[PDB]
Design a protein around this ligand. Structure first.
Ligand code: SF4
Ligand code: SF4
Ligand code: SF4
Lengths: 161, 198, 100, 218, 315, 56, 172, 193, 44
């Protein structure tokens, strides 16, 4: 008899978490330049509520934008661990997705998924500001929906048992 | 090339012991001249350039090494001349080219030093030109050119705990070591590189 | 450019662009297009007489017309003789140049 | 450089009053007063005036006592510049200006009959700067030159459109689809069937873009 | 490892690597690569030179870089709105640039010695003029808050004062050299002028202190002079005069002409000066010429062969 | 060097602070007005219209 | 001296006193320096293999003197003891004992000193620094060991053991 | 979610005309459909409501008004699905309307008659992002792919096709297990006259 | 020259008086006048 209030509580929590998906102020390369352009007045990420937070301890969205190398992978893992929970991860750009042009480079991490868990990926190299906004919106929709994904089964009284 | 150009023969005049070999081509600009120099009188040449009137107003523009070990003329082999940088590179094992710009003469000079010793050790111009610190550090980190008596031998761009010279003719594109996330260690570990081939 | 080179036309009547280095032709065209004075244009044409071209002369005339550059005593003295020589050197493959 | 110039100085245009290009109001007395300040040694080096002036004293007093930077900045940056219209684009409700040459989602085009446009020339694979396009081709059952597998690793694909630029039969194209966010890095590895479906979805706009682009040199 | 990455790929295969080198300025690096390729080939891009598109793209890239630098410096100093203004201006510039290549910040339109002549619109020039007016307004608005603000002045006055010998020792160039009083610039050097600055008049400002405020003033004056030079270059390829009727003086304006529609003719100079090459390019294609098909195959499979030699080209 | 030309920021308009910049601005305004008038003279504008028969 | 190994680059014991009210002193031979290493001058050219060997021995001693602090700071003391780490490093150095070029030896010594300083500055991850200090032919002492190969390939020659394992994937 | 159209916006002839024409449901739903600005509800000009330039196959209605204060805000589209403020996404647009809405080309999709785009037989309906959804594109060799084994077998058989050894009982002519070959080709020289 | 007054390619040198007056300032900044005014106003 605890799921009745929890479901409205889950919905309110999902709305609140979607409303304050603060991206991490952590950018590296041209993909991050495009992401910064997506923070411009023309591309109002503030309309969806995305405000960049400098500290991982106070951040929720990790916008991995740039190329990862052998000299930055441990730092990326440490930042991912230091990110406050719950956390979401979005890798923007081909380098952050799979290395891109440097997929055959000796000084390339050869994929950000092999270093930290990634929730969403963006294809463009660089992705457009519209592409980054669409990816952020999809991630927000998934986070709002993932809170109550119907994992529990409904009893004979239409109650999640 | 409609501007006033002249060979900097004053270098060999002051040296009075080195057979001067200068080259000027239309591939570069009208104020670019390239000369080969012996490594023995290399610091002496650098000091003489750094502290001489009509030449003291100079600044080091770039510095780069060429792995002349495997640099081979691909086509038009019969077209090689008897005073060609291609033949000179084919003769030697490495060629260090330092390009400076002289504002007093408003010209470009390129000193090419041929390295054949297995150690690839040459004197350091870091104590002469300030920008040569980071440049020589990167050059040593990438090609293994040992700048003797250098200001700083610390690494510049190579990954931490990695001992290699990626900018070498022997090194393959993929390298040998790749870093993954070791759950058994709860951190990033490094193993052999198994790369996908085209 | 001119070192170890002869600016003589191959056709012995008019010098085509194929006989000169493309960089020289491009520089001459740019200089003609950027000539904002009658005296300056006359000096540029006279200095570049060895490598002058009919296309370059046509472009200079077009620029003078478009910019409404005044034709002065310099145009009447220096431009006139070179123009007359070029016109005497014209041919049937100079239809566009002559008409322009 | 490659030509010879005699008169090194490029003389300024003739400033005669009767000149056709004589620019009336070219110089404004209300604006051109730099001759008054042309002698200020302070603008040329660390030295100061040989004698300070009451004007300088008053200017320093205005700068220090009034603290006028705050008021001027609030009046100009805030009150005035806050009144401009918003340049933001309604992203969920509208799309921004996208050029026809937009290298969007990679896709496989086809002839109007629906037959595969790919002629297995390997030009795309030899032209992918990162070798992001992989082809495995054998003779077709009918004998056509078509690939058994055509893969594009979007993780290593720069979406540069070089394959489309060097496409021999206009097979590889860059459709306007830009919302290709993938929740799985494995799903991001598009293949032949996926590319064919993507081209099928957006063939019409791709056809219009192709016609317009061909009409550019035509 | 961009060095080995380019070195292990064909000449065209390493083209976009230059854009990733200078992320803010992707056009200057591409132009430098094209000029170096031409120098190795011993030739020059006649169409690119005649179209002045190289100069326009370099000026746009310089303006974008200056705006981005101003935004970053203002954000670091503490100004949070100049970043937004410069970002809107950069968005407009990138929208203009993408009309030529289809990408906001990595265009890679400049090829070694070939130019995509089809992608040239006079409407682009008109929008460039409108953007120049808007950028002048934006620069005035930006200077209204950073040039005279006492806080900004005290945060930049006599900061990092370098000199001629200091710049010479470490080879500081560009805006740093200009602020240090050094009048060195490859654009206005007779032996180093590259594309179009050797014949156009532009004003360059050099600082007398070598401080942060001097660098900021250099950037602002560079943006203004770049706008002016871009206007001049656009006018150089513009048809300012038309045939006027002998009867009366009314201009004889056509009714079915792009000249009547737009005064700018991006193909006029190339068509008048290089009519043979212009006709050859506009007529024959790889889908119609077997030789052109072989050229397309070689350029897309092995690439054009380059003569052996070492060259150094700076932009 | 013996006769420098100094650009001094004196007015609220950086363009007004340079006579060449003001001239460039006036030229841009005049060119825009002339282009607008030339386009307004026709009253109609051709535009690229694709046809489904093109994809035959 | 003005160097990272200089005597004056030692953290004071007290906020107002170097070592004590009667004498000064500090710990920098076995611990990190007071300030960062701005410059790392190249080793002086040694024209004699004797000088090269002396320099190598000095580098080995310096590395050994910091093995305790390196293990303690990285929380990697469980993998092997300080003596065990020293033995592993000695074996690794013996692996390169075939060198005979003084210039190559000097370059290697400079690179090793730089790497050790990076480890001393904690700029590198512990899991990567364990590669040099790991045991050559023994399991890590921070985790259990399985003798499955030793039991199954009991007294089996190296060739047979390699043949039984397979040098490439058995599926492709 | 209340007051999609404010009193100031409702105090215009355009609001009354739209309400009388399209009804209260449509008048209120437009504010929840494609809210861009309170002053831009149904257009910027107050003389009337902007006409519907077209309709998308997914129920979206595309309109355009030149009275907007922003140049990049000329054409707009209202989606049918408006469950939440951030429920709809930019992937719901049709391929035909994508070029018009993005200012790629001034041509717009037409329902019938002359069409700005071709209509071929192989056309497939555009769908939203299948990522994080069951309809996601499945590579041939993925683990979740229900037939990755067949693809792996085919790829291996390209250069490493295994020998079909006998499986079960069979005749043995001495130490040689008797089994027939399965080569599709037929040796005609062995069976010919 | 486009960098000096009365340039040949200026093409905008015909009767720009009204536009120039509208688009440019019409008063010079007298040094110290605002200073004296503000100080006297503050004291009073
Ligand atoms: S994916 Fe492309 S745009 Fe992004 S950082 Fe890498 S090269 Fe730059
Ligand atoms: S260029 Fe076109 S036809 Fe040729 S292999 Fe590539 S996709 Fe196929
Ligand atoms: S768009 Fe560019 S990177 Fe992507 S597959 Fe085509 S050629 Fe390769």
């Amino acid at each position: 008899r605890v799921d009745y209030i929890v479901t409205p509580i889950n919905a309110v929590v999902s709305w609140a978490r979607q409303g304050s998906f603060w991206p991490l102020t952590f950018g590296l390369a041209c993909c991050a330049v495009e992401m910064m352009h997506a923070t411009v007045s023309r591309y109002d990420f503030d309309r969806f509520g995305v405000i960049f937070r400098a500290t991982p301890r106070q951040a929720d969205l990790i916008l991995v934008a740039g190329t990862l190398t052998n000299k930055m992978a441990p730092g990326l893992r440490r930042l991912y661990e230091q990110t406050l929970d719950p956390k979401w991860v979005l890798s923007m750009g081909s380098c952050a997705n799979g290395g891109g042009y440097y997929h055959y480079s000796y000084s390339v991490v050869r994929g950000c998924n092999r270093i930290i868990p990634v929730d969403i990926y963006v294809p463009g190299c660089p992705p457009t500001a519209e592409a980054l906004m669409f990816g952020v919106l999809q991630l927000q929709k998934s986070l709002y929906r993932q809170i109550n994904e119907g994992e529990k089964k409904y009893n004979k009284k239409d109650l999640t048992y | 090339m409609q501007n006033k150009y002249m060979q900097p023969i004053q270098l060999f005049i002051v040296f009075e012991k080195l057979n001067s070999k200068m080259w000027i081509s239309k591939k570069l600009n009208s104020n670019h001249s390239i000369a080969l120099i012996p490594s023995n009188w290399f610091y002496s040449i650098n000091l003489f350039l750094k502290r001489e009137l009509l030449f003291s107003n100079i600044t080091l523009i770039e510095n780069s090494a060429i792995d002349t070990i495997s640099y081979n003329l691909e086509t038009n082999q019969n077209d090689l001349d008897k005073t060609n940088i291609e033949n000179y590179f084919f003769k030697n094992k490495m060629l260090v080219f330092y390009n400076y710009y002289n504002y007093f003469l408003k010209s470009k000079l390129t000193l090419f030093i041929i390295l054949n010793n297995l150690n690839k050790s040459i004197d350091s111009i870091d104590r002469i030109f300030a920008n040569a610190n980071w440049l020589e550090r990167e050059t040593s980190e990438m090609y293994g050119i040992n700048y003797k008596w250098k200001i700083d031998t610390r690494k510049l761009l190579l990954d931490y705990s990695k001992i290699e010279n990626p900018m070498l003719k022997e090194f393959q594109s993929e390298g040998t070591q790749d870093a993954f996330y070791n759950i058994f260690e709860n951190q990033v570990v490094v193993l052999k590189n198994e790369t996908v081939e085209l | 450019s001119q070192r170890g080179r002869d600016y003589t036309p191959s056709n012995k009547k008019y010098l085509q662009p194929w006989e000169l280095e493309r960089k020289e032709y491009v520089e001459l065209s740019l200089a003609i297009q950027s000539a904002y004075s009658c005296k300056m244009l006359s000096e540029i044409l006279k200095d570049n007489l060895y490598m002058l071209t009919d296309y370059q002369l046509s472009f200079a005339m077009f620029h003078l017309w478009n910019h409404e550059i005044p034709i002065d005593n310099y145009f009447y003295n220096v431009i006139s003789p070179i123009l007359k020589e070029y016109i005497t050197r014209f041919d049937r493959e100079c239809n566009k140049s002559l008409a322009e | 450089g490659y030509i010879q110039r005699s008169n090194i100085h490029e003389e300024a245009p003739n400033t005669s009053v009767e000149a056709k290009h004589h620019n009336k109001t070219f110089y404004d007395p209300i604006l051109d007063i730099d001759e008054d300040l042309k002698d200020d040694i302070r603008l040329y080096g660390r030295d100061k005036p040989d004698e300070l002036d009451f004007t300088d004293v008053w200017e320093s007093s205005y700068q220090n006592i009034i603290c006028p930077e705050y008021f001027y900045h609030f009046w100009f940056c805030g009150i005035v510049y806050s009144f401009e219209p918003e340049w933001t684009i309604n992203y969920p409700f509208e799309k921004g200006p996208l050029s026809p040459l937009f290298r969007g989602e990679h896709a496989l085009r086809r002839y109007p009959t629906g037959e595969e446009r790919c002629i297995a020339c390997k030009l795309c694979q030899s032209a992918c700067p990162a070798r992001a396009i992989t082809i495995e081709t054998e003779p077709r059952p009918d004998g056509s030159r078509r690939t058994v597998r055509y893969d594009i690793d979007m993780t290593k694909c720069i979406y540069c459109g070089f394959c489309q630029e060097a496409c021999p039969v206009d097979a590889i194209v860059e459709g306007p689809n830009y919302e290709q966010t993938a929740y799985l890095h494995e799903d991001l590895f598009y293949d032949k069937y996926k590319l064919l479906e993507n081209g099928d979805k957006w063939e019409p706009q791709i056809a219009r873009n192709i016609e317009y682009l061909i009409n550019q040199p035509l | 490892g961009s060095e080995k990455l380019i070195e292990d790929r064909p000449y065209l295969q390493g083209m976009p690597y230059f854009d990733r080198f200078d992320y803010v300025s992707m056009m200057v690096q591409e132009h430098a690569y094209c000029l170096g390729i031409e120098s190795l080939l011993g030739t020059t891009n006649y169409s690119a030179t005649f179209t002045q598109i190289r100069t326009m793209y370099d000026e746009l890239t310089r303006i974008l870089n200056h705006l981005l630098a101003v935004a970053c410096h203002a954000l670091d100093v503490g100004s949070m709105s100049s970043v937004f203004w410069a970002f809107e201006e950069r968005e407009k510039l990138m929208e203009f640039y993408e009309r030529v290549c289809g990408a906001r910040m990595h265009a890679a339109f400049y090829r070694p010695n070939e130019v995509n002549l089809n992608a040239v619109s006079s409407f682009l020039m008109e929008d460039i003029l409108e953007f120049s007016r808007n950028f002048f307004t934006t620069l005035n608005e930006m200077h209204n808050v950073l040039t005279y603000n006492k806080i900004w002045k005290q945060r930049l006055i006599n900061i990092g004062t370098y000199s001629f010998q200091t710049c010479l020792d470490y080879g500081l160039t560009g805006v740093m050299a200009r602020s240090c009083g050094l009048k060195r610039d490859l654009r206005l050097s007779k032996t180093e002028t590259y594309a179009n600055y050797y014949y156009l008049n532009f004003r360059s400002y050099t600082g007398q202190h070598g401080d942060c405020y001097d660098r900021f003033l250099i950037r602002m004056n560079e943006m203004c002079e770049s706008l002016n030079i871009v206007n001049q270059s656009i006018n150089k390829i513009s048809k300012f005069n038309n045939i006027v009727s002998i009867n009366t003086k009314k201009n004889i304006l056509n009714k079915e002409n792009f000249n009547r529609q737009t005064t700018v003719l991006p193909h006029l100079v190339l068509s008048y000066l290089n009519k043979n090459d212009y006709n050859l390019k506009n007529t024959k294609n790889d889908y119609n010429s077997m030789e052109e098909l072989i050229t397309h195959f070689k350029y897309w499979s092995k690439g054009l062969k380059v003569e052996s030699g070492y060259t150094y080209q700076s932009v | 060097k013996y006769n420098p030309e100094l650009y001094i920021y004196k007015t609220y308009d950086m363009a007004a602070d340079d006579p060449v910049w003001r001239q460039v601005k006036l030229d841009l305004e005049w060119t825009f007005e002339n282009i607008a008038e030339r386009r307004e003279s026709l009253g109609y504008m051709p535009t690229f219209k694709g046809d489904p028969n093109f994809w035959q | 001296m003005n160097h990272y190994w200089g005597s004056s680059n030692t953290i004071p014991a007290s906020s107002t006193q170097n070592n004590n009210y009667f004498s000064g002193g500090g710990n920098n031979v076995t611990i990190r320096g007071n300030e960062i290493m701005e410059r790392l001058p190249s080793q002086t050219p040694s024209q004699n293999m004797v000088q090269a060997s002396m320099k190598t021995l000095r580098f080995y001693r310096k590395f050994c003197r910091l093995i305790p602090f390196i293990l303690r700071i990285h929380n990697i003391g469980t993998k092997f003891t300080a003596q065990q780490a020293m033995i592993n490093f000695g074996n690794y150095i013996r692996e390169r004992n075939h060198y005979r070029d003084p210039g190559l030896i000097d370059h290697r010594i400079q690179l090793g000193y730089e790497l050790l300083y990076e480890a001393e500055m904690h700029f590198s991850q512990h899991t990567i620094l364990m590669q040099y200090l790991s045991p050559y032919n023994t399991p890590l002492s921070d985790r259990g060991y399985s003798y499955l190969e030793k039991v199954k390939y009991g007294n089996k020659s190296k060739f047979l053991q390699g043949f039984y394992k397979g040098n490439k994937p058995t599926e492709f | 979610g209340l007051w999609s159209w404010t009193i100031n916006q409702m105090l215009t002839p355009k609001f009354w005309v739209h309400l009388r024409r399209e009804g209260f449901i449509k008048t209120w739903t437009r504010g929840h459909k494609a809210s861009r600005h309170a002053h831009y509800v149904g257009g910027n000009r107050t003389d009337g409501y902007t006409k519907q330039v077209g309709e998308d196959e997914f129920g979206n209605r595309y309109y355009e008004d030149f009275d907007v204060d922003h140049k990049n805000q000329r054409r707009w589209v209202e989606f049918s699905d408006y469950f939440m403020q951030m429920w709809s996404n930019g992937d719901k647009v049709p391929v035909g309307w994508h070029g018009w809405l993005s200012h790629q080309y001034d041509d717009f999709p037409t329902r019938t008659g002359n069409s700005a785009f071709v209509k071929h037989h192989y056309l497939k309906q555009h769908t939203a992002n299948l990522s994080n959804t069951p309809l996601n594109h499945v590579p041939q060799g993925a683990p979740q792919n229900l037939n990755r084994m067949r693809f792996i077998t085919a790829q291996r058989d390209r250069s490493r096709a295994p020998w079909q050894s006998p499986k079960g009982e069979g005749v043995f002519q001495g130490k040689k297990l008797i089994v027939a070959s399965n080569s599709p080709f037929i040796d005609d020289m062995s069976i010919r006259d | 020259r486009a960098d000096m007054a009365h340039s040949p390619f200026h093409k905008a040198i015909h009767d720009l008086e009204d536009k120039r007056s509208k688009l440019f300032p019409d008063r010079r900044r007298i040094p110290g006048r605002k200073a004296k005014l503000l100080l006297a106003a503050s004291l009073l």
